[model samples]
Target: DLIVNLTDSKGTCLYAEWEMNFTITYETTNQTNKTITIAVPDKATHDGSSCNSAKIMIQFGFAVSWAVNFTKEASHYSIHDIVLSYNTSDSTVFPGAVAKGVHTVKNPENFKVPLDVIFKCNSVLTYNLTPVVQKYWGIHLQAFVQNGTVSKNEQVCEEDQ
Candidate 1:
């Protein structure tokens, strides 16, 4: 068994020994808060017997969903992107009024984990959405591929600061 430990600057730790836990929280149209979680397999899946990949898709419904794509390159693996798809027509889960489109962190540079990734829809907004929607629906993620060793350091995310 492999152990991955995430620690803060002060040495407090968040530990996961098996899977990558991904979680998201959002507010529905009826002002109810909902959360969705998708556990990503930590083991590498073979690609052509040379490369490794791990991918997970989380579908909240026909209206909103998310995808995580990760791949390995020789010594380490990285998250290529985290994609979010939303439809305004699905008013059952969305707030007041929102635009319909896909939001993504395309080829993000600092997405290697135990590093943290913070994704907010408002950062790429072109429509009329308020902070209420943005705050209630954002992504904060931390994922890593194990190398049979343990880590004891933390990379702080912007949201935690």
Candidate 2:
């Protein structure tokens, strides 16, 4: 578990205390399978206006803890089926896939996964793994719960569907 500044923009964040947001989904190159997560930071989102210079860290402790149990694949490297999600009083969060050969300038797709299930698990988890991560895009995924357990990575390969 790690807290990334998103490196994209501070504006990709949508502020909400309690309400129904939207879900973001898309498809990317089915070649190099990888996974990405759009995590809800523990700190609040600012408009980059009157704010402190110092930053409040997003605790990966809890998120990492959640991954320990929930993200634990059969061998700590299996990307068969996952569903990365949790429960919240307000909103949801997730990432969208990058389509094949498409150098998407914008995220094209991104969404808020429903926070409906009771989460005793961590807030973060790993999805697909490829030779290159920060270089290129990979697989598409969704977060949800099923059969009384949290689904961090549900197989979405065209062949699996």
Candidate 3:
């Protein structure tokens, strides 16, 4: 018997909200079909309404915007990749700071349809922070985005395995 279900979503946001839900339909070898509802968190919100003035207001946003759709005649799609670029330039920073990430999945076992993915990502915000004693006045704020490596963990696909 083949089984399919949602495990969990390990998404994290400091002051932002997130939600992930899915509806699955699969038939068993025993002739029993099921509709499983998976919702890690139907709704979410930040703890506080706003941040205080003393601290730097850092904002981070992400989106799994573009996921290639599959074709009925296609059994597999290989030589695929996802490349993301993070640039922090033409801002108040010292100088050129950039980051990028490359994620390639080769012939993933049991590839699911309508794959939800997040390809390109970036962030932005503006604020001021005063240093102790030095009292730097009107010091501009510059931000940088660092891309992390994508890893496969059991927590993401616990039920499938």
Candidate 4:
């Protein structure tokens, strides 16, 4: 099955997988509104190898970059931080602007093992180069993690499509 195969520094295995759907909305200098949706990562692979920490990286087009960081705990794991970088000069995506920077979302909460976790980012800003040249974004993510078994009672979020 498709999954992010994780291993500890000592070779103990921990596995996880996720489906993420991202939505972006923006306005150009010409006052044109644009919305885009992206489904990420068709295949999974070994993504991390620390007993307590894991990270996932995603990229889209020529301008959008994302990283999601996770931390493992005694009985659960949580998203520690998320960083999104983008270029407003990418005419295909962020037309009519000329700026670039990163946005960060931190400490989104936690869930237990062998259970489904859902993450949603609603009406979040991607970048705000100017009043007329900025972007807003959201995400719907369903994730599962386990030591050696599959997940149970998978949860769903309203933002999923």
Candidate 5:
């Protein structure tokens, strides 16, 4: 069985561009590694060829953000991130590092933006998990929302299963 949920969001103008973010969290206690996959917004219902792309980026304050390009509707996202974080207290193991990703729009006929994100895991934070391993790991998302001259801020997003 498949469960599909649609998101309802509108832009300021008819074809004006804006930005948004969604964060998801999970719990794990065991030491064995786990993988958490996320969905980027694909552009399959735009006026023309709309698509999105994502990439991992980190800041000085350890601010995790995703750079998305909602230019293509053919694919569901901009970038794919894989993180491995551990929570011994809650028995939850989730993705680590402020995973960064982006989504952009592109033409479907001639310009093709493949959404196949198959990249090796990269690290930005180097900390010993020995202490935090017994407790809980802080929340970090690989996303960034910066538009025009607006002050960049972390997009309001969170998820868990």
Candidate 6:
């Protein structure tokens, strides 16, 4: 699969590691609408960093605290949505600072059909120098896991939930 970094004129930098777990559920479009489920487990890291130079130093000076939930949703047979969230860890980490957005997909062909369930869990540490102020330092340090797998139709058809 190919992932792209969209252009950002703000010169924003990001750093983090992402691990994901995926469970693929397929429902055939034809008669019966057969549904199948599969699971995959693995580790991956998407790392980058960019902060307003001096302001971003908050990553090192402030007491650590943050949690991130990167969620995925599949539309039809394709994975169409990815939600990334960053919230305060309760300490001075802005206490109210939060960041949320979507992932960009340059190549849509990779997510088509044969795709299964995709879920993600992350331990993300973020600090916002300004909860509402612009032109400031913001750092997001995360360790995450991402996984997915292919399965036979039989796995989900056993006879009960």
Each model's TM-score, in the order given? 0.37, 0.17, 0.19, 0.50, 0.17, 0.19
Indicate which candidate wins on TM-score: 4
Off by over 4 Å in 3: 1-16, 42-161
**Which lDDT tens digits does candidate 4 get at residues 41-158?**
4542333333336676656666666566566653455554555555565777665553444333332334333234434444443433322223323433333344433344444443
Q: lDDT by residue for model 1 over 20-76, one digit each (tens)?
A: 333434454555655544333334332211112655554545455545565554234
Measured with C-alpha atoms, the lDDT of residue 19 in candidate 4 is 49
Instruction: Assess the local accuracy of residue 5 in candidate 6 as a C-alpha lDDT between 0 and 100.
Output: 24
The candidate with the higher lDDT, 2 or 5, is 5
Ranking by lDDT: 4, 1, 5, 2, 6, 3
Q: After superposition, how far is residue 21 of candidate 6 from its true place, in Å?
A: 2.5
- The top-ranked prediction according to lDDT is 4
CA deviation > 4 Å runs, candidate 4: 1-3, 7-12, 41-52, 97-161
Residue pairs clashing in model 1 are none
Worst 10 residues of 3 by lDDT: 130-139
The superposed Cα distance between candidate 5 and the true structure at residue 49, in angstroms, equals 22
The per-prediction CA RMSD against the true structure, in angstroms, equals 11.6, 18.2, 25.3, 7.2, 17.0, 21.5
**Which is superior by lDDT, 3 or 6?**
6
Residue lDDT tens for model 3, 8-112: 243211111122222323333355544333332322221222211111111112211112122221332111221111122312211222322322122222222
Model 5 over residues 29-134: C-alpha lDDT tens digits?
4544333432223331222212123322211111222221333334423332222222222222234423233211221222222222211122222222222211
lDDT scores for all predictions? 0.39, 0.24, 0.20, 0.46, 0.25, 0.22
Task: Report, for all candidates in order, the number of backbone clashes.
Answer: 0, 13, 2, 0, 70, 18
